[PDB]
Amino acid sequence: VHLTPEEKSAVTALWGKVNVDEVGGEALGRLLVVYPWTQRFFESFGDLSTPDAVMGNPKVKAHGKKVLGAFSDGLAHLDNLKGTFATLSELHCDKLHVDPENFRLLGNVLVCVLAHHFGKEFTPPVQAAYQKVVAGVANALAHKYH
Amino acid sequence: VLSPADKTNVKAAWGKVGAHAGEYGAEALERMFLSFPTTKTYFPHFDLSHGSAQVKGHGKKVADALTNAVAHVDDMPNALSALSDLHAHKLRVDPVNFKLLSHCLLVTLAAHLPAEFTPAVHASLDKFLASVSTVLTSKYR
Amino acid sequence: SVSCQGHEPAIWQCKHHEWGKHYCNHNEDAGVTCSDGSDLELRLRGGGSRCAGTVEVEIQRLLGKVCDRGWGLKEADVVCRQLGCGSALKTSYQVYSKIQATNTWLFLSSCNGNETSLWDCKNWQWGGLTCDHYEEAKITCSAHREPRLVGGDIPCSGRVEVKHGDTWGSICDSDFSLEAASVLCRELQCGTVVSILGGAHFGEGNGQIWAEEFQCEGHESHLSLCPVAPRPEGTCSHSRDVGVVCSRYTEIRLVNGKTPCEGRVELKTLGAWGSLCNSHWDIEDAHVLCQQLKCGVALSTPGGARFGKGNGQIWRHMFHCTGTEQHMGDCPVTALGASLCPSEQVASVICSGNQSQTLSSCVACIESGQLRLVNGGGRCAGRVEIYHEGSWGTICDDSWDLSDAHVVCRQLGCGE
Numbered sequence A: 001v002h003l004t005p006e007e008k009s010a011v012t013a014l015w016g017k018v019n020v021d022e023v024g025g026e027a028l029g030r031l032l033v034v035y036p037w038t039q040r041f042f043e044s045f046g047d048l049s050t051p052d053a054v055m056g057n058p059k060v061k062a063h064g065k066k067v068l069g070a071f072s073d074g075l076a077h078l079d080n081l082k083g084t085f086a087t088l089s090e091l092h093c094d095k096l097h098v099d100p101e102n103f104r105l106l107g108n109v110l111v112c113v114l115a116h117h118f119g120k121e122f123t124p125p126v127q128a129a130y131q132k133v134v135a136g137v138a139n140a141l142a143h144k145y146h
Numbered sequence B: 001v002l003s004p005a006d007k008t009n010v011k012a013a014w015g016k017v018g019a020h021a022g023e024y025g026a027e028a029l030e031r032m033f034l035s036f037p038t039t040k041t042y043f044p045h046f047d048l049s050h051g052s053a054q055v056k057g058h059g060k061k062v063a064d065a066l067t068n069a070v071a072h073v074d075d076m077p078n079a080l081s082a083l084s085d086l087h088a089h090k091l092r093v094d095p096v097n098f099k100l101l102s103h104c105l106l107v108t109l110a111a112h113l114p115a116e117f118t119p120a121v122h123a124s125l126d127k128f129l130a131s132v133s134t135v136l137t138s139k140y141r
Numbered sequence C: 001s002v003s004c005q006g007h008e009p010a011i012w013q014c015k016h017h018e019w020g021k022h023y024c025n026h027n028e029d030a031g032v033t034c035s036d037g038s039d040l041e042l043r044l045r046g047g048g049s050r051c052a053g054t055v056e057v058e059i060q061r062l063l064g065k066v067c068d069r070g071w072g073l074k075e076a077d078v079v080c081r082q083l084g085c086g087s088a089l090k091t092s093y094q095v096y097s098k099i100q101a102t103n104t105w106l107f108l109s110s111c112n113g114n115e116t117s118l119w120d121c122k123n124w125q126w127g128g129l130t131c132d133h134y135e136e137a138k139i140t141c142s143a144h145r146e147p148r149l150v151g152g153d154i155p156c157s158g159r160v161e162v163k164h165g166d167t168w169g170s171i172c173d174s175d176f177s178l179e180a181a182s183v184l185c186r187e188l189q190c191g192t193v194v195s196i197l198g199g200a201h202f203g204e205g206n207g208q209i210w211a212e213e214f215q216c217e218g219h220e221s222h223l224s225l226c227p228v229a230p231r232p233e234g235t236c237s238h239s240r241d242v243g244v245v246c247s248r249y250t251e252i253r254l255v256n257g258k259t260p261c262e263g264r265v266e267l268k269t270l271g272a273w274g275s276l277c278n279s280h281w282d283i284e285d286a287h288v289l290c291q292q293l294k295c296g297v298a299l300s301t302p303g304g305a306r307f308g309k310g311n312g313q314i315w316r317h318m319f320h321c322t323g324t325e326q327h328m329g330d331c332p333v334t335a336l337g338a339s340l341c342p343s344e345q346v347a348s349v350i351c352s353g354n355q356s357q358t359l360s361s362c363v364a365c366i367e368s369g370q371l372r373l374v375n376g377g378g379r380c381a382g383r384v385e386i387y388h389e390g391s392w393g394t395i396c397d398d399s400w401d402l403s404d405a406h407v408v409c410r411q412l413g414c415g416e
Ligand code: HEM
Pocket: A038, A041, A042, A066, A067, A070, A071, A088, A092, A096, A098, A102, A103, A104, A106, A107, A141
């Protein structure tokens, strides 16, 4: 529906090469230092003042594993994205009150992180499919908001 | 809000780009076109085919302008005065498209030059590109 | 950003930017290099001879190389001139070995192209920067392979000798092909190749013989540019050296006349001087002769001669020049059994004396619509071709007879 079968193959292929342990910590650490208004939500994770502390903090790295796994879980079936993220969207809307833009910002940083880790293999058609995936996830986690 | 330590990274990182700046600008322009199809509406007569000479030519002039801005980092609005009027008063380019080009340009730099993109440099180069977009769009109406 | 004029007693006296600002990086730390001028040396390593290879710089015992970012044909010329080799032809060179890598580099900003040495042209940076994206600088001077013809009676013939570096040597016939000989004649400015002779016809050479066999495409402007491949030494005896005859083997002189641009035509063939026949001496052949004499374009040829026939025998050579070829050798010549020229009929030409504007297709015009004959085995027979606009075309065979072809044979000068 959303993606062509050739587009789906490449997206699923690259997601195999990823190192879930380190990619999640990388993207979360970058967002907390590039856009430094998300440090407010992660005050439970300790010191986050300096970029090296943000990268070296164990808690954000562990939270990166949770973020990455949920992204992989969302990739399981695209039409279910409304129902897949309905449980998580409520947490981000009623308890933490995370603005929908931060979902779009984290996804954009994820594309940059994946491009940094891979290199030339981040073919422009490949990133186009990834952006379409990211846009849906940001919309799906925000569609709960009303 | 580029601090003096932030501008030092910008000049050093852009220096490491070297002569490949023109190709990097061209790749970012092509990367944004196919990733965000609505952007092509602002280029009425340009040939949007992959590897087009005009796209390569446009990327060279875009990277030329950015390299000029780095040398004039302290005074950006004057170095980008002519481009600000053309991009806002003539073509009426929506400011939303600028954040798309900046993201695509950063991805091109990150993919082609991964070793030098430490998180400290990533923030500094991001703040530099945000400064350029605001200057160009500051008179949009 | 210290801006010293060049005469301040100390750097602090110069006008310099503030102790802060400008956002400098520690990789940009400046340095100096003061020397007496005798320690710096320039050498070429990794090539066939000293006039081709990778540029290597030794300054204060320290070895280094030169980056390619600022390299060009102008900078390539000044380096070759300093080494004494000659002019620079190619910015790449064929590798005979591998040179050791060195971390230190030399950078060229710009070079005017007429300086005596590389050190003289301004702002050459010695170390302090790296160019990993760029590569080494390579050159190939014109003294890599300098050809020469030795021991030939006619001006443009003799034994072929090729110079490697600063030493001379002959070349065996098996190494030299027809394509190689054409380049050699063109390089020497002796015209096109007329014939090639082997077996020490011109004479038995002396000295050492090169081993490599030239393998050139055929239209290279210099001997050095075309690639070569080494061959085993001693496979060719000394008697197997080659000789080359080029097309510009004619010597024609103007005499009796006080100004060299005017006078009676004199030709030297068979080891003697002789006057040319007046017949078949038109404007087109006259322009070529004056071009050879370097007088310039010519506008008039005398009808008869006040200069006389001369003491020498009357040569019956007749020339058929198109009008654009530089030398009389390139003009097709027919002299077998030419008609006898009476004593008072001797050719002459009055050149202008100005070498400018040559001849342009349209007086002093290369003309248009000149017919040519192809595939006929000669210059007087063949299929008719007509030059119209920028293309050559044929004629349909219908309504074609002797009276129709009578004009074509007359215009070409062949006859009937
Ligand atoms: C964009 C896609 C995102 C996904 C898939 C995602 C995923 C998750 C998941 C699965 C949890 C549950 C962790 C737990 O229960 O222990 C979580 C927690 C959390 N997320 Fe997200 N997240 C996203 C974006 C963001 C962003 C951009 C922020 C910015 C601050 C954020 C803020 C938080 C916070 C503060 C928690 C902690 C919840 C708590 O402590 O109760 N999320 N995230």
